[PDB]
């Protein structure tokens, strides 16, 4: 998975606590 605090896209699933958010962030 992608850590905490790093940048995502929504459509994808691997950030590490579930979540990516509006601001391009896994929370």
Not at 2 to 23: A, E, G, T, V
Request: glycine share 0%.
């Amino acid at each position: 998975c992608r850590i905490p605090n790093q940048k995502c896209f929504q459509h994808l699933d691997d950030c590490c606590s579930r979540k990516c958010n509006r601001f391009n962030k896994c929370v």
